């Protein structure tokens, strides 16, 4: 269960995290983060590149674990283009809601991850024949994870988590009608 998009995303994250270590956070942040200034708004990469930045090794590992587990499943059973689209829609939207929640200084792949969780869960629910599904041990831990960010158990992007979750559920629900 190793598709091209799964691994290309993992490599990107690792490539970006290395650069953050050579140059420091702020330095990469100033270039990849969501536009802080409407003057920068046509720097179109920014709406996606925030997802690549991680600020702790544990975080890049945790996120890439989820991404490889759930991203591999979508790409294996449903195709690479399907994974591309979940990724781009949810990076864009979870970044958008995160910016409104708390402004432009945020990063990480977990908005995309929560949108993969929403997707794989509702898709395997409404649509078993797709061959993907989320275990209830895992949506135990997804549900525990959103709410831990709530209560500040830890400095989480909370717009990001909730925005992606919604994105994933919404897309899985659409897809489980055209199925």
């Amino acid at each position: 269960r190793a598709g091209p998009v799964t691994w290309v995303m993992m490599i990107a994250c690792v490539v970006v995290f290395i650069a953050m270590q050579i140059l420091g956070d702020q330095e990469v942040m100033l270039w990849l983060a969501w536009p802080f200034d409407p003057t920068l708004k046509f720097e179109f990469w920014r709406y996606f590149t925030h997802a690549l930045m991680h600020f702790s090794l544990m975080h890049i590992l945790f996120n890439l674990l989820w991404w490889w587990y759930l991203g591999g499943a979508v790409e294996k059973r449903l195709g690479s283009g399907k994974l591309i689209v979940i990724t781009l829609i949810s990076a864009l939207l979870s970044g958008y809601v995160q910016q409104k929640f708390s402004g432009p200084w945020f990063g990480g792949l977990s908005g995309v991850v929560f949108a993969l969780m929403g997707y794989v869960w509702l898709r395997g629910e409404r649509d078993p024949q797709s061959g993907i599904y989320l275990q209830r041990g895992l949506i135990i831990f997804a549900l525990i994870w959103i709410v831990a960010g709530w209560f500040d158990l830890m400095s989480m992007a909370n717009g990001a988590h909730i925005a992606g979750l919604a994105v994933g559920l919404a897309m899985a629900f659409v897809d489980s009608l055209n199925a």
Binding site: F55, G107, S155, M156
Partner: peptide, 4 residues
């Protein structure tokens, strides 16, 4: 910052 905040981590997503």
């Amino acid at each position: 910052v905040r981590m997503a």
